[PDB]
Design a protein around this ligand. Structure first.
Ligand SMILES: Nc1ncnc2c1ncn2[C@@H]1O[C@H](COP(=O)(O)OP(=O)(O)OP(O)(O)=S)[C@@H](O)[C@H]1O
Ligand SMILES: Nc1ncnc2c1ncn2[C@@H]1O[C@H](COP(=O)(O)OP(=O)(O)OP(O)(O)=S)[C@@H](O)[C@H]1O
Ligand SMILES: [Mg+2]
Ligand SMILES: [Mg+2]
Lengths: 446, 453
């Protein structure tokens, strides 16, 4: 499973100064796709992000490309060169009411009514399509304020008509909250695991999306997938990526979290997890650190511990064939899991999330430095070559250490007590190859 | 115990275009059986399925055969060539009301009042016999809708007379739910176990059905039957089969399920199991994964664990001789079970559910591919010969892997994101002998043939 050419899959191209509500295609592409000037369209990017836009023809736009500005790209979680899909969006109703909120660092020193100075002029007679979760910037007077759509009615998208009530009351959204959302883990945040992610799409996502495929040929897909491998290889990261990328309902079950609960509560929470999944099928259940809740029914002296293992076995068996629920799990101690959980019809497929090679190490180093300020002498391939035996977590730690060393080198220009770090220290901060070589000397993968 | 020739046992034969309410016999058969034109009859198929029909003579019908259409065959869970039984059904009364529901995939884009367009014209002045659980198809305008009979009054069958109230209101039945039902496990879904299924019928079904036989000769039949053998040999499958085939009440007790319950709740559920069985006798109790609830009273450090074992012992002893309850159990670790449970009067009979041979393996492979699209080059006897050391579960896994490989080969025509798989990919999908060879050559099937020489 790689990415196939389809007529509605298009490469993201720039449109500086373009309005937030507009995307451009070439006329032949529009003709191919049966899209007419002014049509509302639905765009799909990464990590299940969507955007509703107006489509306009552009004779400077290549057939295979879509022009869109930076606001739309950010909402779609995509960069220039990425691929998106476009489809008609005919069903879109005029809005009854919408609720948007300002981002806290764009309104410090509250001056000017937000509705009157920003939103009213932005939406005035424009009939903008909007979607819940959109972030958009607006200029008002000599200032710019960033807003988030928190709710729309109808949900999750509508047209902002003259009659749509615009609510902007409440506590401003924190930049840190939205920045945490903005860099939620996707498949792109996973290095050195191309083969495994493909195993995962074929065993988990494909049967949940297209069960007709499996019915057609007359095969029941396996329902239990164990990720295993040593610590820090990316098992939990992959879970986060699946959670954020899948089209199914996702229910995370954390091993130590169940085990931390009162006797009786552990079992109950497991049952509720499976029930929620079932009710919301198609669904994925992910049981992280499976060994914590399901060790061999001999290496648990506790009656409650054996009981919880029994409870999971019952829940795995209890999942009807037509439930459309795939259970994923992860462990760094697979030989410690009760063998009963590994029988036909339970966890009977396995995916080795192991030690990356040099090429995978480089992938991982590029991912973990993407938001890091690097000097021009940083050679990551050279770092990749010198980190044999390192897994993903050792590489992220190495990157952090090089950064921390870069900061340590300015401790002669920082005083802990100042309320403000000197701007020119802030502006010039870069991680150098030397900082990396120094971390390479401190890095111990154990 | 094999199948005996009886005058009312007949071979299922085709009747294309026949009405859903009609079966045909030869006139001599009808004479033999004392059946007259238009009589209502009760048909019995597999997995306790029944059908009520009208019987008509047919001079093209062999004496030993019964003609019936595809609707009736599906209701009886039988195919062409299977045997069914027929008997008069004189007791049948006009229904006060019946309730049916459409199948969801037959009503998408809800066009038409279902009663007026389909049911009314289907039942109009026809006086159709119908049974709870029947599925039947009806054409109305340019469409066809499949319905299930969910309830009848009287129950479970009646005649749909002019004055019978037909209800079709409610949420449509899911096709997936009925496909699951249709493919519920029977004795035909168990391969390579002929000898053991006979042991089971002789030790379980026979004393429950004909206790007089055992009384007459003066013998108390054993009341505890332990199925044992290695993992994936079909112990649970057999339990499913028995549950769906037996004429008795069936109460399943799952080991890990009892063990997952609160201290005190485990013991209570065991008691309730035995009580329900007793109240509903003749009954079978099946305790799957017995080792989970009854390991040796030394290899359990838990007071509650020892208490549960004691509870089962008490419940086994507590079953009066006239209770008409047979307890089956299954385990893949029989030497781990408390020896007290294997004394005279408890689990004192045993059935070895073991490794199949090549002929058994082939049976298993035909069962597991019956609903699978096979290419013409698939040679299952050859697959049987190349799976030494394989049990049932390994054969089902082998089949699934071949099919999964077949799908993997089309991953250049499938994009995960499409709403719809391309039709001609759907239509042409078949598992080939190469797909099977690929599955056979895999680490796991290959490591497994060494295991049993
Ligand atoms: N394949 C990878 N690609 C990119 N970053 C990775 C990878 N593996 C690990 N990392 C980094 O290391 C961090 C910790 O890894 P986790 O996914 O929590 O390890 P894990 O495999 O779940 O470990 P265990 O078994 O719970 S100790 C991640 O959150 C990433 O920042
Ligand atoms: N004799 C058989 N005939 C046909 N199919 C079988 C047979 N045995 C196993 N299978 C297949 O393998 C699957 C698992 O078999 P089960 O009956 O659950 O195994 P089991 O013997 O109960 O295993 P344990 O002891 O609980 S691990 C079944 O659902 C069938 O698909
Ligand atoms: Mg982890
Ligand atoms: Mg079993």
């Amino acid at each position: 499973l790689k990415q196939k050419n389809r007529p509605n899959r298009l490469i993201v191209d720039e449109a500086i100064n373009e309005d937030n509500s507009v995307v451009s295609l070439s006329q032949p592409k529009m003709d191919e796709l049966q899209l007419f000037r002014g049509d509302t369209v639905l765009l799909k990017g990464k990590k299940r992000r969507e955007a509703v836009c107006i489509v306009l023809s552009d004779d400077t736009c290549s057939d295979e490309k879509i022009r869109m500005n930076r606001v739309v790209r950010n909402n779609l979680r995509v960069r220039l060169g990425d691929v998106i899909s476009i489809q008609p969006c005919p069903d879109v109703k005029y809005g009854k009411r919408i609720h948007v909120l300002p981002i806290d660092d764009t309104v410090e020193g509250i001056t000017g009514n937000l509705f009157e100075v920003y939103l009213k002029p932005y939406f005035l007679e424009a009939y903008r399509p909007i979607r819940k979760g959109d972030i958009f910037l607006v200029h008002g007077g000599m200032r710019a304020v960033e807003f988030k759509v928190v709710e729309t009615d109808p949900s999750p998208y509508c047209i902002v008509a003259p009659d749509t009530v615009i609510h902007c009351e409440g506590e401003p959204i924190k930049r840190e909250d939205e920045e945490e959302s903005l860099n939620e883990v996707g498949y792109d945040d996973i290095g050195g695991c191309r083969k495994q992610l493909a195993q995962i799409k074929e065993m988990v996502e494909l049967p949940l999306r297209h069960p007709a495929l499996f019915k057609a040929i007359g095969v029941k897909p396996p329902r239990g997938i164990l990720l295993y491998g040593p610590p820090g290889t990316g098992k939990t990261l992959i879970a986060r990526a699946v959670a954020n990328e899948t089209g199914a309902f996702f229910f995370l079950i954390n091993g130590p979290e169940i085990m931390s609960k009162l006797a009786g509560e552990s079992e109950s929470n497991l049952r509720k997890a499976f029930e929620e999944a079932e009710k919301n099928a198609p669904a994925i259940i992910f049981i992280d650190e499976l060994d914590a809740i399901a060790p061999k029914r001999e290496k648990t002296h506790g009656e409650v511990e054996r009981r919880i293992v029994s409870q999971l076995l019952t829940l795995m068996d209890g999942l009807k064939q037509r439930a459309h629920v795939i259970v994923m799990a992860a462990t760094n101690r697979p030989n410690s899991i009760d063998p009963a959980l590994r029988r036909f019809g339970r966890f009977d497929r396995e995916v080795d999330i192991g030690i990356p090679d040099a090429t995978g190490r480089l992938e991982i180093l590029q991912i973990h430095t993407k938001n890091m300020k690097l000097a021009d002498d940083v050679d990551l391939e050279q770092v990749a070559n010198e980190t044999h035996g390192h897994v993903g977590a050792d590489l992220a730690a190495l990157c952090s250490e090089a950064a921390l060393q870069a900061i340590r080198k300015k401790m002669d220009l920082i005083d802990l007590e100042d309320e403000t770090i000197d701007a020119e220290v802030m502006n010039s901060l870069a991680v150098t190859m030397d900082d990396f070589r120094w971390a390479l000397s401190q890095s111990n993968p154990s």
